[PDB]
């Protein structure tokens, strides 16, 4: 009984991902988000441990929703005749990182360091759980404004993590790496690092560096905002044209620009409250 366990509120948004409503769990007034996806629009299908055929998004969410993390957790899901309904955590109050950056402009490096660190921890958690997100971008990051915590959303373009080559991609092209643009081939971790370089530039400059295929493969990074040499170095390393020249997640988090990160609570008090 989906309609009796949750009170459905206003529409929060819709797009390639489906339609997402605000909701409240009737059992305990927990804020939730209620995401509807039409079956005919679902390209990638998978199998839960039980064997029931579900959208891949459900498989991946279940793999990463165990325990606490910087990933928006799947609380429950329902199958309807023509759709699946996903019940997801809802931070309150909340704003996605795209809107935050539009409103604030380029972020102070201290704030970008805190946000970027938390995204790295969230992506490491996904990879630890065998999940590749494949659509890391500011639009797919939510900010819990009171707690100063970032939450990754939308595994609708994701895949099981593997060590062999990927030849399919349905994420966001302006965050996709030059080897995808040029050859329609990429490896999961090095492609993720590229998208993180795009995201970090986006945070400290106020918008992404590349809009066109020619810019993505040209690999020239122009800084439109004052950015420290240490931060520039990390961005340019993540955006290396050759995938094997990009840092590992360990090398990113050991980079000099990443040290002395604020705690999430400190981040909220200094920058969000």
């Amino acid at each position: 009984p989906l309609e009796s366990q949750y009170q459905v509120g206003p529409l929060l948004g819709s797009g390639g991902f489906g339609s997402v409503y605000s909701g409240i769990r009737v059992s305990d007034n927990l804020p939730v988000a209620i995401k509807h996806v039409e079956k005919d629009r679902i390209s990638d299908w998978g199998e839960l441990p039980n064997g029931t055929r579900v959208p891949m998004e459900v498989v991946l969410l279940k793999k990463v929703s165990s325990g606490f993390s910087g990933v928006i957790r799947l609380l429950d899901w329902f199958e309807r005749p023509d759709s699946f309904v996903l019940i997801l955590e809802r931070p309150e109050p909340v704003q996605d990182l795209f809107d935050f950056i539009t409103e604030r402009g380029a972020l102070q490096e201290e704030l970008a360091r805190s946000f970027f660190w938390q995204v790295l921890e969230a992506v490491r958690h996904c990879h630890n759980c065998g999940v590749l997100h494949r659509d890391i971008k500011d639009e797919n990051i939510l900010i819990d404004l009171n707690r100063g915590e970032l939450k990754l959303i939308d595994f609708g373009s994701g895949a099981l993590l593997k060590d062999t080559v990927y030849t399919d991609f349905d994420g966001t092209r302006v965050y996709s790496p030059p080897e995808w643009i040029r050859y329609h081939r990429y490896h999961g971790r090095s492609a993720a690092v590229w998208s993180l370089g795009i995201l970090l530039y986006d945070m400290v400059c106020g918008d992404i560096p590349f809009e066109h295929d020619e810019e993505i493969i040209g690999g020239q990074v122009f800084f439109r905002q004052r950015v420290s040499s240490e931060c520039q170095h990390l961005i340019r390393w993540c955006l290396a044209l050759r995938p094997s020249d990009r840092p590992t997640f360990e090398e990113i988090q050991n980079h000099p620009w990443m040290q002395d990160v604020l705690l999430p609570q400190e981040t909220a008090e200094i920058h969000l409250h």
Partner: peptide, 9 residues
């Protein structure tokens, strides 16, 4: 230039 969202796919 204008900042814009970019749909997946």
């Amino acid at each position: 230039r204008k900042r814009r969202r970019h749909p997946s796919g």
